[PDB]
Design an enzyme around this catalytic site. Structure first.
Site, PDB file in Angstrom:
ATOM      1  N   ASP A 132       0.867  -1.151   0.000  1.00 28.43           N
ATOM      2  CA  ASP A 132       0.000   0.000   0.000  1.00 28.43           C
ATOM      3  C   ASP A 132       0.914   1.213   0.000  1.00 28.43           C
ATOM      4  O   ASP A 132       1.896   1.249   0.744  1.00 28.43           O
ATOM      5  CB  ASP A 132      -0.896   0.003   1.239  1.00 28.43           C
ATOM      6  CG  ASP A 132      -0.106  -0.110   2.530  1.00 28.43           C
ATOM      7  OD1 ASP A 132       1.093  -0.453   2.468  1.00 28.43           O
ATOM      8  OD2 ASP A 132      -0.688   0.141   3.608  1.00 28.43           O
ATOM      9  N   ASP A 149      -2.600  -8.628  -6.428  1.00 30.90           N
ATOM     10  CA  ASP A 149      -2.922  -7.252  -6.033  1.00 30.90           C
ATOM     11  C   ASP A 149      -1.859  -6.199  -6.358  1.00 30.90           C
ATOM     12  O   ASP A 149      -1.921  -5.097  -5.816  1.00 30.90           O
ATOM     13  CB  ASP A 149      -3.418  -7.150  -4.582  1.00 30.90           C
ATOM     14  CG  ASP A 149      -4.521  -8.168  -4.246  1.00 30.90           C
ATOM     15  OD1 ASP A 149      -5.630  -8.129  -4.842  1.00 30.90           O
ATOM     16  OD2 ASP A 149      -4.274  -9.015  -3.364  1.00 30.90           O
ATOM     17  N   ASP A 170      -8.229 -13.413   5.761  1.00 32.44           N
ATOM     18  CA  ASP A 170      -7.758 -12.414   4.789  1.00 32.44           C
ATOM     19  C   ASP A 170      -6.921 -11.438   5.566  1.00 32.44           C
ATOM     20  O   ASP A 170      -5.904 -10.910   5.064  1.00 32.44           O
ATOM     21  CB  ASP A 170      -8.923 -11.752   4.020  1.00 32.44           C
ATOM     22  CG  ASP A 170      -9.493 -12.658   2.926  1.00 32.44           C
ATOM     23  OD1 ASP A 170      -8.684 -13.421   2.344  1.00 32.44           O
ATOM     24  OD2 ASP A 170     -10.732 -12.617   2.651  1.00 32.44           O
TER      25      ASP A 170
HETATM   26  O1  LIG Z   1      -9.215  -9.071  -4.519  1.00 32.58           O
HETATM   27  C1  LIG Z   1      -8.615  -9.097  -3.218  1.00 32.58           C
HETATM   28  C2  LIG Z   1      -7.984  -7.741  -2.927  1.00 32.58           C
HETATM   29  O2  LIG Z   1      -9.008  -6.759  -2.794  1.00 32.58           O
HETATM   30  C3  LIG Z   1      -8.468  -5.446  -2.670  1.00 32.58           C
HETATM   31  O3  LIG Z   1      -9.530  -4.494  -2.646  1.00 32.58           O
HETATM   32  C4  LIG Z   1     -10.064  -4.259  -3.948  1.00 32.58           C
HETATM   33  C5  LIG Z   1     -11.323  -5.098  -4.139  1.00 32.58           C
HETATM   34  O4  LIG Z   1     -10.967  -6.482  -4.203  1.00 32.58           O
HETATM   35  C6  LIG Z   1     -12.052  -4.701  -5.418  1.00 32.58           C
HETATM   36  O5  LIG Z   1     -13.332  -5.342  -5.455  1.00 32.58           O
HETATM   37  C7  LIG Z   1     -12.237  -3.192  -5.496  1.00 32.58           C
HETATM   38  O6  LIG Z   1     -12.841  -2.845  -6.748  1.00 32.58           O
HETATM   39  O7  LIG Z   1     -10.966  -2.548  -5.387  1.00 32.58           O
HETATM   40  C8  LIG Z   1     -10.368  -2.774  -4.113  1.00 32.58           C
HETATM   41  C9  LIG Z   1      -9.098  -1.940  -3.995  1.00 32.58           C
HETATM   42  O8  LIG Z   1      -9.420  -0.552  -4.148  1.00 32.58           O
HETATM   43  C10 LIG Z   1      -7.667  -5.348  -1.376  1.00 32.58           C
HETATM   44  O9  LIG Z   1      -7.062  -4.054  -1.288  1.00 32.58           O
HETATM   45  C11 LIG Z   1      -6.584  -6.417  -1.319  1.00 32.58           C
HETATM   46  O10 LIG Z   1      -6.006  -6.445  -0.008  1.00 32.58           O
HETATM   47  C12 LIG Z   1      -7.156  -7.789  -1.648  1.00 32.58           C
HETATM   48  O11 LIG Z   1      -6.085  -8.726  -1.808  1.00 32.58           O
END
Ligand SMILES: OC[C@H]1O[C@@H](O[C@H]2[C@H](O)[C@@H](O)[C@H](O)O[C@@H]2CO)[C@H](O)[C@@H](O)[C@@H]1O
Length: 322
Positions: free
Chosen positions: A79, A121, A282
């Site tokens: 991040d 990710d 998670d």
């Molecule tokens: O897919 C797992 C992943 O999700 C991440 O957040 C995403 C989310 O999955 C998605 O649906 C959305 O549209 O965007 C967010 C990010 O802005 C999450 O940050 C990860 O930790 C995770 O591995």
């Protein structure tokens, strides 16, 4: 010598086996019988901390000629925000260390068949996360991924799937996503990818994911990237998600059992794969406000730890049922 390593028999690993065993011991009757059948279902082995370079050899010894699926998840920043750390490298050169180490071990096993999924990710964040002060980490991640591909992308006993989020995240940005993927592959020396993995650690239906595969596949084609195949994480996608909550989603169910070439109407799709470990938290509920959403299951242990209650929910909500 088929380029779809999932057509081979898949390797079930001692770690997941031991995780399901913990649940077996707390269960009786019907659910225990179900859990016993989940125990041998092949799941991917995650390389997600600095010590993981020592784990590779054991997996490879115990697997024999069975396909091993590794998920490389050891990039430096996760991040580009305050207070984030504990899973990534100091930097590019520390990362290149980890890559070389894993690459080297792999070289000792010319007869193993290995599937390597590049970091989950990372592409997602490169496309959608903001760019004001996150310029530096952004550029480093791109180098990180290019490096990983340059190494694993040349080993014959390896097939690389670069991870590209999920439809809920990137389907409306397939053009930008292909742009990023195409640049990474340009800096990846002689490394080739077999394809893209999606829905890693997410709940999206195979139906919509394949629609995403199609749109993304086209974007890459119009960029010069041709012949891409796909794998989709089906570990937790038995039931349509109630929302975009990614952390320990309530109501989720085990999805389709891992399989090669599962649908002749989906010719881009190499396989259904269990990439996220079904039952592993998670994140601890305390850790991120998103883990405290109304549709995130509470009492979650730390990320990577067995979450018994969640596993049970996954068992009950399984689709196709037992
Ligand atoms: O897919 C797992 C992943 O999700 C991440 O957040 C995403 C989310 O999955 C998605 O649906 C959305 O549209 O965007 C967010 C990010 O802005 C999450 O940050 C990860 O930790 C995770 O591995």
């Amino acid at each position: 010598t088929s380029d779809n390593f999932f057509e081979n028999e898949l390797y079930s690993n001692y770690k997941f086996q031991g995780e399901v065993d913990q649940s077996i011991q707390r269960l009786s009757g019907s659910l225990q019988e179900k859990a016993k059948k989940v125990k041998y279902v092949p799941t991917a082995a995650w390389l997600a901390w600095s010590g993981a370079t020592n784990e590779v050899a054991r997996y490879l010894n115990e697997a024999g000629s069975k396909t091993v699926v590794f998920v490389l998840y050891m990039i430096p920043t996760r991040d580009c925000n305050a207070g984030g750390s504990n899973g990534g490298a100091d930097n590019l050169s520390t990362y290149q260390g980890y890559v070389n180490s894993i690459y080297n071990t792999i070289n000792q096993y010319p007869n193993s068949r290995i599937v390597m999924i590049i970091e989950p990710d990372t592409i997602g964040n490169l496309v959608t996360a903001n760019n004001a002060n996150c310029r530096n980490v952004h550029d480093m991640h791109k180098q990180a991924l290019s490096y990983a591909i340059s190494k694993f992308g040349t080993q014959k006993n390896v097939r690389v799937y670069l991870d590209a989020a999920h439809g809920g995240w990137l389907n409306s940005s397939a053009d930008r996503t292909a742009e990023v993927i195409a640049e990474i592959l340009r800096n990846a020396g002689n490394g080739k990818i077999r394809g893209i993995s999606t829905n890693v650690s997410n709940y999206q239906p195979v139906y919509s994911e394949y629609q995403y595969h199609q749109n993304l596949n086209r974007a890459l084609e119009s960029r010069g990237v041709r012949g891409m195949k796909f794998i989709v994480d089906t570990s937790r996608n038995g039931r349509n998600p109630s929302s975009a909550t990614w952390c320990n989603l309530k109501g989720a169910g085990l999805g389709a059992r891992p399989q090669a070439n599962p649908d002749p109407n989906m010719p881009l799709l190499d396989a259904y794969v269990w990439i996220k470990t079904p039952g592993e938290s998670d994140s601890a509920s305390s850790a991120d406000p998103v883990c405290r959403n109304s549709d995130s299951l509470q009492g979650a242990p730390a990320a990577g730890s067995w979450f018994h209650d969640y596993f049970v929910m996954l068992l009950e909500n399984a689709n196709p049922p037992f």
